[PDB]
Structure 1
Amino acid sequence: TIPHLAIDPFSLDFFDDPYPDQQTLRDAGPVVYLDKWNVYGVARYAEVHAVLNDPTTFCSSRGVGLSDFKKEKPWRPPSLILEADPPAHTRPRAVLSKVLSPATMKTIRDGFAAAADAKVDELLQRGCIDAIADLAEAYPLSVFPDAMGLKQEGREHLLPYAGLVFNAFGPPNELRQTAIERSAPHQAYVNEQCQRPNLAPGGFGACIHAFTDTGEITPDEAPLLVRSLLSGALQETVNGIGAAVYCLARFPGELQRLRSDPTLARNAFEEAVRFESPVQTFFRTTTREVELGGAVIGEGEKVLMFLGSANRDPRRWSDPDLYDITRKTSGHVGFGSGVHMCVGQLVARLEGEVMLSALARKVAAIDIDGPVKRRFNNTLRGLESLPVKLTPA
């Protein structure tokens, strides 16, 4: 009853052009079986959304990657937030929700904005830049590590540890195997940085440790919660900002509308989050026999959710392959959905908005003038290099 496919969603030429294979996954049926890895797959918006909003049946405690934590040892101590179910997930979530609260964005908005404008002034003096190295990577690095309260020496390990975490969600391919057999410089650094003494006062990390008196988390849980924001924050936001600049480079009509109304900068970033989906996939593990899309899935089965394919479903979106900065982007699963929906979505949208804002007010044209290279990862979609010349406004 369930269609079996030989498509490998974690192969290099799937990453090169995933959109043709993603409709084959959508059009094969509401639920497919991927024989390459012995997992169930869901690529339509309706099934992806349903799985994310049923955490008791499609849990996260047994791993949000391919590995079943009930069968294999995790490559690192499990996350107290991402790889946890309610109720153990509830209050560690409530902490990170308050550390990255609306009231917290009020304190960093000016610095995040001024550092975006300063960066968009710095490359305009250069003209021909790399939008990945000098914009998509440079700006979040110039702002988020300071917002965490991190020291200066050792920050070269943050992006490599970011790519390792998302590569380790994938199957035991060479991308995952090679990422792990590097690690422990990145591991030991990220580990060492989560200790309370190395967290500058006022930063996100020092605020997480202060949230141990509250009885929501204990002092031994605080280092892992700091590790989460050091594992999934930089790269997907870097990939997200690199997505929007790419789209404004591909769709000059949308760049012109953003210039005419810089208020659209926040939704322009959100549509780019849906259009590229930096976090492409995430697994869930069935806690019981479940029926979804006429399919009977047994206990302990891995269910792969195609977040990017669900963001391009024509059953849910109108002309989903075109970037529209005015689209009603509400409902996209780029940030997840349900109890696990991204806890730092406010930090990501803040970074993306003020960066597109500075582009909206100071940039006239964004023209590709060099070979565009792609960065391959088991879970992350993003560009390695985006050679661009920025025309000043």
Structure 2
Amino acid sequence: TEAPDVDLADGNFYASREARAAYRWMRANQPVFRDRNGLAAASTYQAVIDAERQPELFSNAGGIRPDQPALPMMIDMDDPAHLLRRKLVNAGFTRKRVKDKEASIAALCDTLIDAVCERGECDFVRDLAAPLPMAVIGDMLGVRPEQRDMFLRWSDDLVTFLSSHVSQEDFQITMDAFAAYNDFTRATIAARRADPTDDLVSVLVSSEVDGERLSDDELVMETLLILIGGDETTRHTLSGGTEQLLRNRDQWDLLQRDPSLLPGAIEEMLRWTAPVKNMCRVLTADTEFHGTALCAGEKMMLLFESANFDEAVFCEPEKFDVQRNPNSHLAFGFGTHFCLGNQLARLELSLMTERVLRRLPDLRLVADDSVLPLRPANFVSGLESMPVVFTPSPPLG
């Protein structure tokens, strides 16, 4: 009955395997919780949904990180301006455009598995989970394969900034990474304005809504939002979700014998892993919210992992169950800002997992999860490393 002594802006909290016990106390005793520094956080599924449904009170226009200002990106915007920006960028994310990527994503999955399959061991994080989303989003943005690692480095630097209160040295690194991304992207824009192709910048250049188009400034900001979504999130559901399949081998075995269970497995991997641990909302007025007094101008976190483990919604939430129905998890949020990339992320998860199951059918963890660390970060986090072993096989291509 004593509250957990926690700092919800500290990345070390999210790397602890005790975070879920802290969330459990919040949900049972103070659903809109204030941490040791007074930062407010919605911990229950009900409170998160209710805040998501009230964007005029719980605004994104102060920025979605604690103690960082808004950027001119759709995720830091409110309607009506947000709705126009999202409609413009949606040209890249129509259901048909995303579903048509299936063969190309599958090819990348097979190339990555081909690189390890003869060895009998790999680091699942380094060799499969991190590179696959990077290659997909890189290919959309025109990145040469041998330059993916450079983009991944810029992205890891940007997410480090989003995930902490950086030193001056890490602030400078962040500004350098943006400057390099800006240069590359404005070069792509200029090339595609002169010679359109069918890549993401081409589709976004030509997108038009209510007589409006995206400016070059907006194209840089929106493709940067997409890059980071495309290379810093899905990786952690691939690793951590596969980790749960290997820890609970009855679950691995169900999927291997029935491919039609894969869609529900991907949803359970998303629920469990919740790579995005929080998004902030700024209060536009003083308000009494699920029992807690909130003040105009402060930021409240939405705790999506906590909501995904709320017993009021998910029976036995600490049981990983690929068959779980319903599974209305909040890994992608809810409402006006619901992840634009959700279909792409689900497709990448599906195509890689189906190939892991079939091509590495006896996959096992080298050492159990108790020695596998999570990355300290207050925004997006998952496994650092996941050594796995399997019976070798020959490549496909």
Q: Normalization by structure 1: what TM-score?
A: 0.89
1:32 pairs with 2:25: no
Taking structure 1 as reference, are residues 5 and 374 closer, same or farther at Cα in structure 2, changes over 3 Å only? closer
Alignment of 1:1-393 (within 5 A): 6-9=5-8, 10-17=10-17, 18-36=19-37, 38-67=38-67, 69=69, 78-152=71-145, 154-170=147-163, 172=165, 179-195=170-186, 196-197=189-190, 201-211=197-207, 215-220=211-216, 221-328=218-325, 330-370=327-367, 372-391=372-391
The SS at the match of 1:305 is strand
The SS at the match of 1:182 is helix
Q: Give the stretch that moved more between structures: 329-338 or 163-172.
A: 163-172
Taking structure 1 as reference, are residues 29 and 244 closer, same or farther at Cα in structure 2, changes over 3 Å only? same
Taking structure 1 as reference, are residues 197 and 151 closer, same or farther at Cα in structure 2, changes over 3 Å only? farther
Aligned-residue offset at 1:261: 1.0
Provide the rounded CA distance (Å) in 2 between the counterparts of 1:294 and 1:320.
24
Q: Give the stretch that moved more between structures: 291-300 or 349-358.
A: 291-300
Aligned-residue offset at 1:257: 0.6
- Whether the 8 Å CA contact 2:62–2:76 is kept in 1: the answer is yes
Higher relative contact order, chain-length normalized (CA < 8 Å, sep 6+): 2
- Whether the 8 Å CA contact 1:280–1:381 is kept in 2: the answer is yes
The SS at the match of 2:80 is coil
- Whether the 8 Å CA contact 2:42–2:303 is kept in 1: the answer is yes
Provide the rounded CA distance (Å) in 1 between the counterparts of 2:14 and 2:85.
35
State the one-letter code of the partner of 1:264: L
Q: Give the stretch that moved more between structures: 176-185 or 343-352.
A: 176-185
Aligned-residue offset at 1:213: 8.1
Aligned-residue offset at 1:14: 4.5
- Whether the 8 Å CA contact 1:372–1:387 is kept in 2: the answer is no
Taking structure 1 as reference, are residues 285 and 246 closer, same or farther at Cα in structure 2, changes over 3 Å only? same
Provide the rounded CA distance (Å) in 2 between the counterparts of 1:156 and 1:79.
27
Aligned-residue offset at 1:225: 1.5
The SS at the match of 1:232 is helix
Aligned-residue offset at 1:241: 1.1
Q: Which has the larger share of helix?
A: 2
Provide the rounded CA distance (Å) in 1 between the counterparts of 2:336 and 2:62.
16
The SS at the match of 1:285 is strand
Q: Normalization by structure 2: what TM-score?
A: 0.88
- Whether the 8 Å CA contact 1:58–1:287 is kept in 2: the answer is yes
Task: Deviation per CA, 1:317-347: give whole Å up to 9, x if none.
Answer: 0111121111125421100100100001111
- Whether the 8 Å CA contact 2:283–2:295 is kept in 1: the answer is yes
Aligned-residue offset at 1:361: 2.3
Provide the rounded CA distance (Å) in 2 between the counterparts of 1:151 and 1:114.
16
Provide the rounded CA distance (Å) in 2 between the counterparts of 1:380 and 1:204.
24
Taking structure 1 as reference, are residues 368 and 60 closer, same or farther at Cα in structure 2, changes over 3 Å only? same
Task: Deviation per CA, 1:240-259: give whole Å up to 9, x if none.
Answer: 21122211221111111111
- Whether the 8 Å CA contact 1:212–1:222 is kept in 2: the answer is no
Aligned-residue offset at 1:265: 2.2
Structure 2: where are the runs of 5+ without partners? none
- Whether the 8 Å CA contact 2:256–2:358 is kept in 1: the answer is yes
Provide the rounded CA distance (Å) in 1 between the counterparts of 2:23 and 2:82.
31
Task: Deviation per CA, 1:192-231: give whole Å up to 9, x if none.
Answer: 2322036682112221112158734332322221121122
Q: Give the stretch that moved more between structures: 223-232 or 338-347.
A: 223-232
The SS at the match of 1:296 is strand
Q: Which has the larger share of strand?
A: 1
Aligned-residue offset at 1:137: 1.4
How many residues align structurally?
A: 381
Aligned-residue offset at 1:141: 2.6
